[PDB]
Design an enzyme around this catalytic site. Structure first.
Site, PDB file in Angstrom:
ATOM      1  N   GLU A 180      33.602  38.440  38.516  1.00 10.54           N
ATOM      2  CA  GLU A 180      34.669  38.908  37.621  1.00 10.54           C
ATOM      3  C   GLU A 180      34.335  40.196  36.890  1.00 10.54           C
ATOM      4  O   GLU A 180      35.241  40.894  36.436  1.00 10.54           O
ATOM      5  CB  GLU A 180      35.012  37.838  36.572  1.00 10.54           C
ATOM      6  CG  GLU A 180      35.531  36.524  37.131  1.00 10.54           C
ATOM      7  CD  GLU A 180      36.950  36.598  37.668  1.00 10.54           C
ATOM      8  OE1 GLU A 180      37.389  35.607  38.292  1.00 10.54           O
ATOM      9  OE2 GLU A 180      37.642  37.634  37.467  1.00 10.54           O
ATOM     10  N   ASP A 182      44.327  42.440  36.503  1.00 11.83           N
ATOM     11  CA  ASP A 182      43.521  41.771  37.517  1.00 11.83           C
ATOM     12  C   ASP A 182      44.038  42.099  38.923  1.00 11.83           C
ATOM     13  O   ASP A 182      44.887  42.982  39.085  1.00 11.83           O
ATOM     14  CB  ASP A 182      43.477  40.253  37.278  1.00 11.83           C
ATOM     15  CG  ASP A 182      44.817  39.550  37.506  1.00 11.83           C
ATOM     16  OD1 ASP A 182      44.886  38.344  37.198  1.00 11.83           O
ATOM     17  OD2 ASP A 182      45.793  40.148  38.000  1.00 11.83           O
TER      18      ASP A 182
END
Length: 162
Positions: A11, A20
């Site tokens: 991440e 994202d």
């Protein structure tokens, strides 16, 4: 290696609001804020999550706190789900981390939808599970990450994160 380091690798860390892989406002270590296209809505979610007026920027400590909460939430989501819990309970520690990783990325409901993959994993048919897991929007949209998680399910090692 452990689930926290694994997810930090997958991440990364960003201290300002970003989008994202699906275009959704996010912060920290993959903390999804909202699916709303409104940055203001995302900022409101952030302030609520952190407990102060942030104007879209947080500290590393704050990002890590959200991260710990999110890993905890993924684990509890697994344990409260009738489809996910028996698979989780059947797995060794390394493969349990692979399942947490999936839930962290796509949510309890999303992973619970991998019905046939989950069955193969419970049967410990690792190569077959790996092939089935890759037949997914998940794999096609984030193939390098999915490949790391699938390799973890296939081998029961951390080789893909070394």
């Amino acid at each position: 290696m452990n689930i926290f380091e694994m997810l930090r690798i997958d991440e990364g860390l960003r201290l300002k609001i970003y989008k994202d892989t699906e275009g959704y406002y996010t912060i920290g270590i993959g903390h999804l804020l909202t699916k709303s296209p409104s940055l203001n809505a995302a900022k409101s979610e952030l302030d609520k999550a952190i407990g102060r007026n942030t104007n879209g920027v947080i500290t590393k400590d704050e990002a890590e706190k959200l991260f710990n909460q999110d890993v905890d939430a993924a684990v509890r989501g697994i344990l409260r789900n009738a489809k996910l819990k028996p698979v989780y309970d059947s797995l060794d520690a390394v493969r349990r981390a692979a399942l947490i990783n999936m839930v962290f990325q796509m949510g309890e409901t999303g992973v619970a939808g991998f019905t046939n993959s989950l069955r193969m994993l419970q049967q410990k048919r690792w190569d077959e599970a790996a092939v089935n897991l890759a037949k997914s929007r998940w794999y096609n949209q984030t193939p390098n990450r999915a490949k790391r998680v699938i390799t973890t399910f296939r081998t029961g090692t951390w080789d893909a994160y070394k």
